[PDB]
Design a protein around this ligand. Structure first.
Ligand code: CLA
Ligand code: CLA
Ligand code: CLA
Ligand code: CLA
Ligand code: CLA
Ligand code: CLA
Ligand code: CLA
Ligand SMILES: CC1=C(C#C/C(C)=C/C=C/C(C)=C/C=C/C=C(C)/C=C/C=C(\C)C#CC2=C(C)C[C@@H](O)CC2(C)C)C(C)(C)C[C@H](O)C1
Ligand SMILES: CC1=CCCC(C)(C)[C@H]1/C=C/C(C)=C/C=C/C(C)=C/C=C/C=C(C)/C=C/C=C(C)/C=C/C1=C(C)CCCC1(C)C
Ligand SMILES: CC1=CCCC(C)(C)[C@H]1/C=C/C(C)=C/C=C/C(C)=C/C=C/C=C(C)/C=C/C=C(C)/C=C/C1=C(C)CCCC1(C)C
Ligand SMILES: CCCCCCCCCCCCO[C@H]1O[C@H](CO)[C@@H](O[C@H]2O[C@H](CO)[C@@H](O)[C@H](O)[C@H]2O)[C@H](O)[C@H]1O
Lengths: 101, 162, 107, 732, 33, 30, 90, 108
């Protein structure tokens, strides 16, 4: 939730579509692509790093890392979508404060 | 690989059958929506000044992707995101895409599984194999005749859609 | 503003006399960029006679330094206790070397 | 960890060195765990099938990408005005001005302009449309699939060949000389006579009509009659327009000599008779060795019998048969040396005597082709000497080679290396002295005092070929010589017209700058040979390391003892000679490009006056011709050269990055990595993540190789960007 | 260009999906015991 | 010029070559 | 390593004497030195004559003189075989 | 000596950070100008990296005579701002303005 929420901002403000009317949509889509790439990284890390054990309540177990990866994917998508909603509906966030001037 | 349900397995046959049944549905609905003109501004060429260099196609006129093709791709993007989340974070009851290393493979159904009508895995596998074969047949009938795939579906359903 | 400083003149041997460029002031030589002309103008040196006397002073100080090196190694070498006075060395070098040097140059 | 499954020692490595060394030793099959000779040869056979398939797929890709996105059908109509398209550009990182600036060649999409010359080659051999280009691409896809299947099949049981089949020298020599060289050349002559020459004369010949369209009006009756000279009658007129019947002849086999006056390339009938004659000669060569029928020569008997009776070669060539047959590295060194010589020959003879229509006017293509095949030549020659050194380490048995020619090379290696050292120092001292002498005396305003030696030996050779520029009046430049009278009825008029017209690169005029740059080339060749020969002959041992063969071809050092033993292996001599190879191909390509650029500009006197001193090379060639390349993009805009303008800088970057691996060495980087390992292990929220392989610094040999790779890539990309963008900016 | 959709379809796949899947599977292969 | 069908035929031939290349790579890998 | 194969009938022809054994002449191993020397002289004469007939080469050379010109390089191998047979006591 | 690993590791990280976010700006600008995207560059007519702290220090030093050095007639140097001191039609010293390029080269 935390990392996916803050991932939208740099893509929205500095991406190649930043001066277009679809800047936020492009930034959210770029954040989603980065999230999917990082989830693949998490998955292959867990595949090569952990042996299949009964223990599943710890992060450094195979089942525990799969649970952590699932939670990270769902939280990242949710946080990115929340940031998209807030920037879409609040003009203060679109201009990073310049709407007050 | 093969110990996780990938390759020539019954798991992969079931998953590709599900995706092919959905694909037949999506092709029929695409033919219906395009025939009735229900895709808004379908012949509008997307401009590079708004959507960037990803919209460039380099055809002979316009050099841009049509709005209908972009809309169809975004419709596919929705279910692709659903696909990624279901593959990484499946429902607790749901059949999984990748299986654990010590899993029990489903027995191959042979020529035809036992004739269990309803919301049974046998009916799912039968209609899935049928849909995969139908996609093969529709593609071959489209490329051996020059008829567009939406039009090939519309003739094969006897102009019901449009 | 119109004469390029030049204090090196080459001998003509193999065509290297081309390096004696037209530097202005009716002079041919290698243009120098060390800034000595500006230093001498700032010091008030207006003639080449004063530069000759400065050169003699430098040569005499070079001889004095090389004699001092020979004397303070080969004739009268200070002991280790003399070298290990950091406080006295700092006092003399701050007040006498830098301080009196700045005062005499201000003079 | 079981990635390097061929090496148990590598698979038990706990560090990141395992992945690198498994990558770097993967195709070194002789060193693998439990490798037998039979399995080694069978794997090599299948790998050779795979490389053949890769070549066919690459050629099919060139053909397909041209038939789909090129302008071949437009270029055929106007060959001297239309820019040939290699492939289309689809790069989403482009802005709109880059899309506009790369939209060339008469098409509506961004394209790259081809520099490989495939247009001229395919047009000359008779291709006219995009359809036959596409058909050729399909055929090469099918051929690549066939060779992939053959590689799979000849590894299957009851198809794996035995070692006696692989070491059958006589049968392979007979079949590869008579069939692979001879019958292929005869079939290519057939293609030129049957297809290429009629399409050059405006007549379409394809698979649909080639059995009913006779190559010659008289048919095969003059061939079966023995009246072969009928095929030489009525050649193409000097008014012939290529690809049309206007001014076309009917001859199929001539010996005209010189160039077609319009295409500025060799006559296609001359090429057809050439490949026919080459096929006949090679088929005669391919009946020389005995395979199954009593007649033919034995290679072992020829080798053992050629010992000079004066005893100066010792035992002569006795034991060379088994030494060469048993060593694949001896074979690889011989093959790479011969290939490198012949691709150098290709580079020289193809600029001097072009065979493709209108390619002599494509200056960018000529520069790229010469530079490409000469760099390939340098790589091949370095590989020949490297694999010869590997043969001395791994496969040389002294007891099997008693008093042999190889043994006597090893017995006077000190004389060989010392005389190579002397000739390198001789050439370098005096060549650099003449250049610096000229630089100093021109800088001091007296260019008339320069030491300018006329290259009269090579000018005498040019006059012997018929060049009347120098007034030597000998052989073909003398109108009364027996050599002149001997060839006067066959090829002398066309050859003399081509050599004495200053419109081509046939025996270009040479002066003192040419003298100096060939003696610099002689320096660089002798010095690279010195490094490579010294590496090969000291590969088994030296005074500093008499047991070097126990340590293999490649190892880092033997430690700081005995004075220090950095770069003592023969692999390190390969590594040192790579820089000298890059230097010599740099000098050769610099000379070629500057001479040709000044000639094409009509300003050959600029080369004649500026090449005698180094500042002329730096100012009038490097600095002067860099201006359109470095202005491919600027603060005012960009154009199509911008990619080369990028690649140039790219090269200047990666070359410099190579320096980091060649100057800084291991222990510094290992201590930094130890500090980084501590930092990761002690950092919260990151020590939850753990490496599977321990991070280590790159090894000594690996770092030498990686610095060499970055250095070489920077060298190649920098010069390729410079030569293509400079020739394009000046002429295109 | 005939079949102009093919560059925009294949270039992102060949340049991003192919190396990602190759790097992932090669990583799994070289790191597994 | 070249049509869509011709490009598809070339793609099918390339896929056949891909299958054969995978088989050769597996055979060489033992 | 593995046995290097040779064609059937391959013998050891390594020599350190004044002349090689006659086996290096292959099928000509039984020809006397006088016959070899006479054939070498005749081959030189015929090859030189045929070559001199075809030195001003035209587009219709005589095939017989073209064939006979190849006896001039044949005569070198013939006199080498003559020396070999003469120093082999034949 | 006993926390040399912490010192060298933090210095290594800050060196990599400085290299990336200083030289990669030049690489990014090379690529953007080569790709025909001038509006995507780091420049004064593009996405700006203003050296605001050094410009502020220059403003302070220009405002210093009469305000924070009240008995100085002129600035310590005209490089901070002020008039063009010229001798013999040649500039002796003039203000040295700082822009995006100055930002990038000072961080280099
Ligand atoms: C998806 C279900 C579906 C539906 C609703 C239809 C409906 C129709 N098809 Mg059809 N068809 C189908 C599947 C279907 N088909 C399949 C799977 C194939 C094989 C590829 C065909 C092949 C086919 C042909 C070749 C023809 C039809 C035709 C027709 C129309 C009149 C004849 C008839 O009653 O068909 C009877 C049912 C079948 C032929 C197959 C079921 C009718 C509207 C005819 C027509 O007028 O089309 C324009 C015609 O000529 N169909
Ligand atoms: C450097 C080149 C070279 C050399 C030196 C040789 C040498 C040889 N080859 Mg070889 N060969 C070569 C190139 C070469 N070859 C090439 C390039 C090819 C293939 C394209 C072949 C293919 C080849 C085959 C297939 C065979 C040879 C054979 C031989 C051997 C036969 C010797 C011979 O002819 O005695 C013959 C003796 C004579 C001709 C003496 C003449 C007899 C009398 C004196 C005639 C004169 C009578 C009178 C004076 C003239 C008037 C007559 C009139 C009345 C009609 C010999 C060692 C043969 C062999 O033995 O293999 C080992 C064999 O089978 N070669
Ligand atoms: C047709 C040409 C040819 C062939 C078959 C080979 C084949 C071989 N070379 Mg050779 N080589 C060649 C050209 C060739 N090379 C050229 C042109 C050069 C000069 C650049 C070299 C320089 C060279 C060196 C310096 C070395 C080899 C080595 C090797 C062996 C292993 C290669 C390896 O592990 O890389 C695997 C690389 C990859 C999988 C990356 C893709 C193998 C027998 C190495 C060896 O083990 O020999 C003892 C070695 O040290 N070669
Ligand atoms: C411009 C750079 C440069 C130069 C001049 C040389 C020069 C030389 N290299 Mg070399 N080398 C270089 C770069 C260079 N290398 C690089 C980058 C590599 C890759 C690592 C190599 C790798 C290499 C190898 C592996 C070998 C050489 C060899 C040689 C020598 C024979 C070639 C030659 O011309 O002899 C003539 C010599 C020269 C031109 C040297 C210059 C002599 C000067 C001009 C004489 C004047 C001296 C001057 C008066 C001193 C005054 C100083 C004082 C005022 C303080 C020679 C000493 C080979 C060798 O030793 O052969 C015997 C050899 O085996 N080099
Ligand atoms: C070993 C040194 C060496 C080497 C490798 C070369 C190499 C080359 N020379 Mg060069 N050359 C040399 C010395 C050398 N030269 C010397 C000393 C001279 C006299 C000034 C020349 C004069 C010369 C001319 C005029 C030409 C070449 C050319 C060439 C190229 C073609 C081959 C040729 O003509 O051979 C020529 C080399 C020799 C005949 C002999 C070289 C080897 C001996 C041992 C040199 C020693 C000479 C000795 C010190 C002097 C004897 C005493 C004397 C004062 C009485 C080739 C790059 C040609 C060229 O540029 O083509 C483009 C050309 O036209 N050379
Ligand atoms: C041949 C390979 C290739 C391709 C096809 C692209 C394609 C693209 N790059 Mg690029 N890039 C590449 C290599 C490549 N890059 C390399 C090697 C580098 C390093 C130098 C970069 C560095 C780079 C930067 C720094 C940036 C791009 C950007 C872009 C986008 C262009 C602007 C635009 O309209 O975006 C609009 C973007 C979108 C609408 C978002 C698309 C999101 C995708 C579809 C999600 C895909 C998810 C993932 C790949 C799923 C697979 C995971 C699996 C492999 C494990 C475009 C998608 C820019 C961009 O916008 O990035 C997003 C940008 O800022 N690239
Ligand atoms: C131009 C040549 C060059 C380059 C690029 C480098 C680069 C580097 N050196 Mg180095 N070095 C060089 C020459 C070079 N060196 C030479 C000649 C020597 C000889 C004395 C040394 C000696 C040396 C020492 C002794 C040390 C370094 C250190 C460093 C690092 C500094 C940290 C940094 O800037 O990170 C940022 C990285 C860069 C600026 C590299 C370029 C990357 C740019 C920004 C583009 C990135 C694009 C992206 C990766 C594309 C991905 C595409 C995908 C397909 C892969 C860095 C890896 C220090 C180090 O490692 O500690 C920090 C160190 O201690 N070097
Ligand atoms: C139709 C298409 C797709 C669908 C799809 C499916 C997954 C592809 C069809 C697939 C199957 C896997 C092909 C079957 C092959 C069997 C052999 C060739 C015949 C053997 C006897 C998707 C899901 C992308 C949606 C799309 O909007 C429409
Ligand atoms: C500024 C501060 C001062 C100086 C020091 C300092 C500490 C370093 C600094 C902090 C800098 C940093 C550290 C500041 C801290 C920053 C982080 C980046 C804030 C992240 C917040 C994430 C929330 C808002 C997303 C919440 C999820 C919402 C409710 C979702 C609902 C969703 C769920 C899934 C359900 C479905 C509906 C949807 C909408 C899809
Ligand atoms: C080190 C290594 C260890 C063991 C294995 C190993 C590979 C064997 C070895 C490496 C050996 C290395 C690789 C050797 C590499 C060697 C070099 C490259 C061989 C070049 C040979 C040139 C020949 C003699 C052609 C010369 C032209 C002459 C005849 C022409 C004359 C005439 C022609 C006919 C026509 C007109 C012109 C004139 C001039 C009138
Ligand atoms: C027995 C001792 C002497 C033997 C000599 C043998 C000479 C070589 C024989 C050549 C092959 C057979 O030749 C025989 O069939 C050929 C079939 O194409 C005929 O060739 C004919 O047809 C060809 C194909 O359309 C035409 O290009 C020819 O102009 C035409 O002559 C020959 O006219 C005929 O003689």
């Amino acid at each position: 939730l935390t990392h996916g929420y803050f991932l939208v901002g740099p893509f929205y403000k500095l991406g190649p579509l930043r001066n277009s009317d679809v800047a936020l949509l492009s930034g959210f889509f770029s954040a989603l692509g980065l999230i999917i790439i990082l989830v693949a990284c998490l998955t292959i890390y867990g595949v090569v790093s952990f042996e299949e054990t009964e223990a599943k309540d710890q992060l450094q177990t195979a089942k525990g890392w799969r649970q952590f990866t699932s939670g990270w994917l769902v939280g990242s998508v949710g946080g990115a979508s929340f940031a998209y909603i807030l920037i879409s509906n609040i003009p203060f966030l679109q201009t990073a404060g310049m709407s007050m001037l | 690989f093969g110990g996780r349900g990938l390759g020539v397995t019954v798991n992969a046959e079931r998953w590709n059958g599900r995706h092919a049944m959905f694909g037949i549905f999506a092709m029929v609905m695409t033919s219906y929506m395009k025939g009735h003109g229900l895709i808004p501004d379908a012949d509008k060429i997307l401009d590079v000044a708004q959507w960037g260099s990803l919209a460039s196609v380099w055809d002979g006129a316009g050099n841009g992707i049509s709005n209908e093709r972009a809309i169809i791709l975004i419709a596919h993007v929705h279910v692709l995101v659903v696909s990624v989340i279901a593959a990484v974070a499946p429902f607790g009851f749901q059949d999984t895409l990748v299986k654990e290393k010590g899993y029990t493979p489903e027995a191959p159904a042979g020529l035809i599984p036992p004739f269990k009508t309803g919301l049974t895995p046998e009916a799912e596998l039968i209609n899935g194999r049928l849909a995969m074969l139908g996609i093969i047949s529709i593609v071959t009938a489209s490329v051996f005749t020059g008829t567009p795939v939406v039009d090939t579906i519309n003739l094969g359903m006897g102009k019901i859609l449009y | 503003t119109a004469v390029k400083p030049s204090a090196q003149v080459v001998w003509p041997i193999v065509g290297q006399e081309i390096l004696n460029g037209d530097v202005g002031g009716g002079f041919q030589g290698v243009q120098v960029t060390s800034g000595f002309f500006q230093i001498w103008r700032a010091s008030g040196i207006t003639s080449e006679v004063e530069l000759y006397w400065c050169a003699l002073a430098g040569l005499l100080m070079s001889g004095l330094m090389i004699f001092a090196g020979w004397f303070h190694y080969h004739k009268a070498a200070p002991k280790l206790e003399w070298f290990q006075n950091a406080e006295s060395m700092l006092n003399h070098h701050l007040s006498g070397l830098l301080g009196l040097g700045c005062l005499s140059w201000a003079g | 960890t079981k990635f390097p499954k061929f090496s148990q020692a590598l698979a038990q490595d706990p560090a990141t060195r395992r992945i690198w060394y498994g990558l770097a030793t993967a195709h070194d099959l002789e060193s693998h765990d439990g490798m037998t000779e039979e399995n080694l040869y069978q794997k090599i056979f299948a790998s050779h099938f795979g490389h053949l398939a890769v070549i066919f797929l690459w050629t099919s890709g060139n053909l397909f990408h041209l038939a789909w996105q090129g302008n071949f059908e437009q270029w055929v109509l106007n060959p001297l005005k239309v820019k040939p398209i290699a492939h289309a550009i689809w790069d989403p990182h482009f802005g709109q001005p880059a899309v506009k600036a790369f939209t060339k060649g008469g098409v509506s999409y961004p394209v790259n302009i081809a520099t490989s010359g495939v247009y001229h080659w395919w047009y000359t051999i008779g291709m006219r449309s995009n359809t036959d280009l596409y058909a050729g691409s399909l055929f090469l896809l099918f051929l690549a699939g066939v060779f992939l299947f053959a590689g799979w099949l000849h590894l299957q049981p009851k198809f794996r060949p035995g070692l006696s089949w692989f070491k059958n020298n006589e049968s392979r020599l007979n079949h590869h000389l008579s069939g692979l060289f001879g019958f292929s050349s005869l079939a290519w002559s057939a293609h030129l006579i049957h297809v290429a020459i009629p399409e050059a004369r405006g007549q379409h010949v394809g698979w649909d009509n080639f059995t009913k369209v006779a190559p010659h009006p008289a048919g095969l009756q003059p061939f079966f009659s023995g009246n072969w000279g009928v095929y030489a009658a009525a050649p193409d007129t000097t008014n012939h327009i290529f690809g049309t019947s206007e001014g076309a002849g009917t001859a199929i086999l001539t010996f005209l000599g010189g160039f077609h006056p319009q295409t500025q390339a060799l006559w296609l009938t001359d090429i057809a008779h050439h490949h026919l004659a080459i096929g006949v000669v090679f088929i005669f060569a391919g009946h020389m060795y005995r395979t199954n029928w009593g007649i033919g020569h034995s290679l072992k008997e020829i080798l053992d019998a050629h010992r000079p009776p004066g005893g100066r070669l010792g035992a002569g060539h006795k034991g060379i048969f088994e030494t060469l047959t048993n060593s694949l590295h001896f074979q690889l060194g011989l093959a790479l040396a011969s290939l490198g010589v012949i691709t150098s020959l290709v580079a020289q003879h193809m600029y001097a005597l072009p065979s493709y229509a209108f390619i002599a006017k494509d200056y960018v293509t000529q520069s790229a082709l010469y530079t490409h095949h000469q760099y390939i030549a340098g790589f091949l020659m370095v590989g020949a000497f490297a694999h010869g050194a590997i043969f001395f380490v791994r496969d040389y048995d002294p007891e099997q080679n008693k008093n042999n020619v190889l043994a006597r090379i090893l017995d006077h290696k000190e004389a060989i290396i010392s005389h190579l050292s002397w000739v390198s120092l001789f050439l370098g001292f005096h060549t650099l002295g003449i250049y610096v002498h000229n630089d100093v005396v021109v800088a001091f305003g007296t260019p008339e005092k320069q030491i300018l030696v006329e290259p009269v030996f090579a000018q005498w050779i040019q006059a012997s070929s018929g060049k009347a520029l120098y007034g030597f009046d000998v052989f073909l430049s003398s109108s009364n010589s027996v050599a002149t009278n001997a060839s006067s009825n066959i090829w002398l008029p066309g050859w003399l017209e081509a050599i004495n017209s200053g419109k081509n690169s046939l025996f270009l005029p040479i002066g003192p700058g040419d003298f100096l740059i060939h003696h610099a080339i002689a320096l660089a060749l002798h010095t690279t040979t010195l490094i490579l020969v010294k590496g090969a002959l000291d590969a088994r041992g030296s005074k500093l390391m008499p047991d070097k063969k126990d340590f293999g071809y490649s190892f880092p050092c033997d430690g700081p003892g005995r004075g220090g033993t950095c770069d003592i292996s023969a692999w390190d001599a390969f590594y040192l000679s790579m820089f000298w190879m890059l230097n010599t191909i740099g000098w050769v390509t610099f000379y070629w490009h500057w001479k040709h650029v000044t000639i094409w500009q009509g300003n050959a006197g600029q080369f004649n006056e500026s090449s005698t001193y180094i500042m002329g090379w730096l100012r009038d060639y490097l600095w002067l011709n860099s201006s359109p390349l470095i202005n491919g993009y600027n603060p005012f805009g960009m154009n199509s050269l911008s990619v080369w303008s990028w690649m140039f800088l790219f090269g200047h970057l990666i070359w410099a990055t190579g320096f980091m691996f060649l100057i800084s060495w291991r222990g510094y980087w290992q201590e930094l990595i130890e500090t980084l390992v501590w930092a990761h292990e002690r950092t919260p929220l990151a020590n939850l993540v753990r490496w599977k392989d321990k991070p280590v610094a790159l090894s000594i040999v690996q770092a030498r190789l990686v610095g060499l790779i970055h250095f070489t890539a920077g060298y190649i990309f920098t010069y390729a960007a410079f030569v293509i963008a400079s020739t394009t900016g000046k002429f295109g | 260009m005939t079949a102009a959709y093919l560059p925009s379809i294949l270039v992102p796949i060949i340049g991003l999906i192919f190396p990602g899947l190759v790097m992932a599977f090669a990583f799994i292969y070289i790191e597994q015991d | 010029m070249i049509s869509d069908t011709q490009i598809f035929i070339a793609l099918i031939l390339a896929l056949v070559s891909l299958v054969l290349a995978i088989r050769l790579g597996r055979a060489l890998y033992q | 390593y593995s046995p290097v194969p040779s064609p059937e009938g391959t013998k050891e022809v390594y020599w350190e004497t004044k002349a090689p054994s006659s086996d290096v002449l292959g099928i000509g191993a039984g020809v006397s030195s006088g016959n070899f020397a006479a054939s070498s002289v005749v081959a030189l004469m015929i090859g030189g004559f045929c070559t001199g007939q075809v030195i001003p080469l035209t587009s219709d050379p005589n095939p017989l003189f073209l064939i006979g010109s190849f006896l001039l390089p044949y005569s070198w191998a013939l006199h080498v075989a003559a020396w070999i047979q003469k120093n082999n006591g034949k | 000596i006993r926390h040399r690993d912490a010192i060298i590791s933090h210095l290594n990280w800050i060196c990599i950070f400085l290299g990336f976010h200083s030289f990669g700006l030049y690489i990014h600008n090379d690529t953007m100008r080569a790709l025909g995207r001038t509006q995507d560059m780091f420049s004064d007519t593009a996405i700006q990296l203003k050296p605001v702290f050094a410009q502020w220090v220059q403003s302070i030093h220009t405002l210093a005579p009469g305000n924070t050095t009240p008995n100085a007639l002129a600035t310590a140097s005209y490089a901070f701002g002020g008039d063009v001191v010229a001798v013999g039609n040649k500039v002796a010293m003039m203000p040295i303005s700082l822009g995006t390029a100055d930002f990038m080269v000072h961080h280099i």
